[PDB]
């Protein structure tokens, strides 16, 4: 889904549209080192 998408993406703009956005955001910052591409 579009979390996953997000997450594959690693993009925090797109952890916006997912549900639970911090939790996109973590898992984010979990798949890509922060500060992101």
């Known amino acids: 889904d579009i ?3 997000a997450i594959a993406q690693c ?3 797109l952890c916006q ?3 639970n956005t911090p939790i996109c ?3 984010v910052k ?3 080192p ?3 591409s």
């Open 25 to 27: 955001e973590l898992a």
């Open 30 to 32: 979990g798949s890509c």
């Open 34 to 36: 922060p500060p992101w």
């Open 3 to 5: 979390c996953d998408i």
């Open 11 to 13: 993009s925090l703009t």
């Open 17 to 19: 549209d997912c549900e």
